[PDB]
Amino acid sequence: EVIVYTSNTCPHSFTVKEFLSENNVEFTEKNIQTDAAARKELMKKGIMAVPVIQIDEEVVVGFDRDKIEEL
Amino acid sequence: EVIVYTSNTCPHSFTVKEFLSENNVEFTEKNIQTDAAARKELMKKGIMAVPVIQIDEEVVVGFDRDKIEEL
Amino acid sequence: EVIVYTSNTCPHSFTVKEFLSENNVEFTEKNIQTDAAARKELMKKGIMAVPVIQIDEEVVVGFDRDKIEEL
Amino acid sequence: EVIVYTSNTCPHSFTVKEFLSENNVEFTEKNIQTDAAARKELMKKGIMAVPVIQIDEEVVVGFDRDKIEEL
Amino acid sequence: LSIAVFALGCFWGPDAQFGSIKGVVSTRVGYAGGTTNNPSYYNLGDHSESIEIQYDANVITYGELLNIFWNLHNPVYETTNRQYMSRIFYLDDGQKSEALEMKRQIEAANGEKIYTEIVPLENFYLAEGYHQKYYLQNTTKLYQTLKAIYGGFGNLVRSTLAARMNGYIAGNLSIASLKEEMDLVELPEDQYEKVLSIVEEI
Amino acid sequence: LSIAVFALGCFWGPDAQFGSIKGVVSTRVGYAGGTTNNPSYYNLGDHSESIEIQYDANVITYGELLNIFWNLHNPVYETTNRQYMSRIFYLDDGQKSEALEMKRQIEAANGEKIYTEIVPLENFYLAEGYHQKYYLQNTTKLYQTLKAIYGGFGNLVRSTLAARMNGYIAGNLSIASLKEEMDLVELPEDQYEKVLSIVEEI
Structure with missing residues (x-):
């Protein structure tokens, strides 16, 4: 059972969805910019507990070790 | 120049901060649960554009390919 | 009705416990570092944040003072 | 005062452009897929979201209808 | 589909x-x-x-x-x-x-x-074959490399990777997402770096 | 500090x-x-x-x-x-x-x-040496392995990795964060998997 919390931003939601569908993994999509209940449920997860690292300009979301190493 | 947007949740903010300080990288920390301006600035970044994938119970934030593969 | 998931190695757990008692709020404590049932219950809730403040149906992750005040 | 960072390969860029014109909102369009200056300006702003709605100082990322309505 | x-x-x-x-x-x-x-x-x-x-x-x-x-x-x-x-x-x-x-x-x-x-x-x-994946087909190097990989013009132009490559050659696709689609294809690693070598030459 | x-x-x-x-x-x-x-x-x-x-x-x-x-x-x-x-x-x-x-x-x-x-x-x-990193020191296997790695009792107990290991042995530390600190130490890979083999035996 898979849920994908999406947005109205076209780079990455479609990336995750294409990856999941191409691997034949069936999922249900909740758009947190059109489904207020979905965003309230995502906030009940520790989503504001994830840190964000700003390197002069770029943004790393979560502790992505190798990415932060490269900058 | 490095900025770390932190929270009042002790697992991961301290993880990122210990990683950065141990590598002698000097950073400034903005706690988005005590600095409303910091959270408004983080929201001006595309932080709600990052997707979240719920696998039955666990939460993957961003397109972490290998993690999603393992579940 | 309040429940508080806490841990020993977390300053923010202590700070929000002190906040709740300073505001005379009866609450249940589930220390996930010594109560294995509590920690696995929190584990398959999707969260991994510590501390978690479950207000009967809402969920506050971390010591968001202004959000907890709103109840 | 409104600026809209858009792209050709994005449905939500088109939808928010249609929203703004349907609500008679004069706006500047910076199509980052053909205006290299606009895309690099957005690039070293921290964002990589598309579409971005800059309302003079505030930033709306994606087609958050209710948030854009608030102005 | x-x-x-x-x-x-x-x-x-x-x-x-x-x-x-x-x-x-x-x-x-x-x-x-x-x-x-x-x-x-x-x-x-x-x-x-x-x-x-x-x-x-x-x-x-x-x-x-x-x-x-x-x-x-x-x-x-x-x-x-x-x-x-x-x-x-x-x-x-x-x-x-x-x-x-x-x-x-x-x-x-x-x-x-x-x-x-x-x-x-x-x-x-x-349409005629010379109109299919028109931009990619005209970068003869990468074109014939990918065509040898996919084993024929028909197998090539009918693929997702060919559409993404034709778009990237036309400047309509980020190189990062081209890498993401190439990961989706799961090339046997050697052809992968050959293709990446050719695409980053541009 | x-x-x-x-x-x-x-x-x-x-x-x-x-x-x-x-x-x-x-x-x-x-x-x-x-x-x-x-x-x-x-x-x-x-x-x-x-x-x-x-x-x-x-x-x-x-x-x-x-x-x-x-x-x-x-x-x-x-x-x-x-x-x-x-x-x-x-x-x-x-x-x-x-x-x-x-x-x-x-x-x-x-x-x-x-x-x-x-x-x-x-x-x-x-305090006496037998009180330092007390829980880790009493898991003689992993203890002497880490002590041979760090080259002495004093170098061992004065380290961050030893504090984290003593805490994990006492059940006060997630195994994931133990892996994170071990990554911080940057062990020469062979000692790394030896230590991980010993810690996951428990």
């Missing part, structure tokens, strides 16, 4: 743009809208230059493809040049409904009447 | 807990608060069983360490058992200020007076 059929002018651009869209599985360019059998590029008749898009409906909606369609051209002018007319060939009544609704909405939102015509799809004929 | 000195009962627990904290660089257990030179475990005198924490101030605050301090025991009872008394040995007036303020706040918030005493640090004496 669903099919849409659009027409918005010369189809090189539409091919290179729609083939960069995540959720689009494959693209073909051809001719549709006329009353003649097997039209050719210099013998279209009443046909329109069209693109057939095969898309994964779990990733992108027909309505989102329509958003992109009206985002790639502004048909606020009426021409009788059938080769370049703006048309939506619908395969079922749901496509017809969505297209008519969105056309009404655009007309009302911009105050300009839209001259895109929503018509039922009769026959979509393929 | 700063130093705090606490006392909250028998120091095995405090060692194993504070050594699991990210931001704590090293820990030592010993004796502090008495008027005798070089006390021993069976000859403490008026000394208290204490822990000295060396912590990276860029990661964790003295006040957060105090939060953890009062989160590991509830000193709402007054004893004259000096070996196990709750004390905060301050190294400067800032520590004294923060500790007094937080003690007042706890007393007011819970309605119970706090009997932790805030006193100036005179001399912190080290």
Whole structure:
């Protein structure tokens, strides 16, 4: 059972969805910019507990070790 | 120049901060649960554009390919 | 009705416990570092944040003072 | 005062452009897929979201209808 | 997996743009809208230059493809040049409904009447092979490398990777997402770095 | 890099807990608060069983360490058992200020007076070697493996990895964060998998 919390931003939601569908993994999509209940449920997860690292300009979301190493 | 947007949740903010300080990288920390301006600035970044994938119970934030593969 | 998931190695757990008692709020404590049932219950809730403040149906992750005040 | 960072390969860029014109909102369009200056300006702003709605100082990322309505 | 059929002018651009869209599985360019059998590029008749898009409906909606369609051209002018007319060939009544609704909405939102015509799809004929993946096919190096990898022109142009590559060559695709699609293809590593070596030469 | 000195009962627990904290660089257990030179475990005198924490101030605050301090025991009872008394040995007036303020706040918030005493640090004496990293030192397998890696008991117990390992053995540390600290140490890969093999045996 898979849920994908999406947005109205076209780079990455479609990336995750294409990856999941191409691997034949069936999922249900909740758009947190059109489904207020979905965003309230995502906030009940520790989503504001994830840190964000700003390197002069770029943004790393979560502790992505190798990415932060490269900058 | 490095900025770390932190929270009042002790697992991961301290993880990122210990990683950065141990590598002698000097950073400034903005706690988005005590600095409303910091959270408004983080929201001006595309932080709600990052997707979240719920696998039955666990939460993957961003397109972490290998993690999603393992579940 | 309040429940508080806490841990020993977390300053923010202590700070929000002190906040709740300073505001005379009866609450249940589930220390996930010594109560294995509590920690696995929190584990398959999707969260991994510590501390978690479950207000009967809402969920506050971390010591968001202004959000907890709103109840 | 409104600026809209858009792209050709994005449905939500088109939808928010249609929203703004349907609500008679004069706006500047910076199509980052053909205006290299606009895309690099957005690039070293921290964002990589598309579409971005800059309302003079505030930033709306994606087609958050209710948030854009608030102005 | 669903099919849409659009027409918005010369189809090189539409091919290179729609083939960069995540959720689009494959693209073909051809001719549709006329009353003649097997039209050719210099013998279209009443046909329109069209693109057939095969898309994964779990990733992108027909309505989102329509958003992109009206985002790639502004048909606020009426021409009788059938080769370049703006048309939506619908395969079922749901496509017809969505297209008519969105056309009404655009007309009302911009105050300009839209001259895109929503018509039922009769026959979509393929265009000549030299029109398929036109930009990629003209970068002979990377083109023949990928064609040897996919083992034939037909297997190449019918693939998702070829659509993404043709789009990237046309500047409509980030190199990062090209790497992401290449990861999706799962190349046997050696061909992978050969292709990446050729693409980063540009 | 700063130093705090606490006392909250028998120091095995405090060692194993504070050594699991990210931001704590090293820990030592010993004796502090008495008027005798070089006390021993069976000859403490008026000394208290204490822990000295060396912590990276860029990661964790003295006040957060105090939060953890009062989160590991509830000193709402007054004893004259000096070996196990709750004390905060301050190294400067800032520590004294923060500790007094937080003690007042706890007393007011819970309605119970706090009997932790805030006193100036005179001399912190080290405890015997068999009290250092007590839980890790008693898992002889992993203990001697890590000791051979770090090349001596002193180099071992003075390290961050040893504090994290002693905490994990005591069940105060996630195995994931143990892996994270091991990544921080940058072991030459072979010793890395040897240590991981031993730790996952438990």
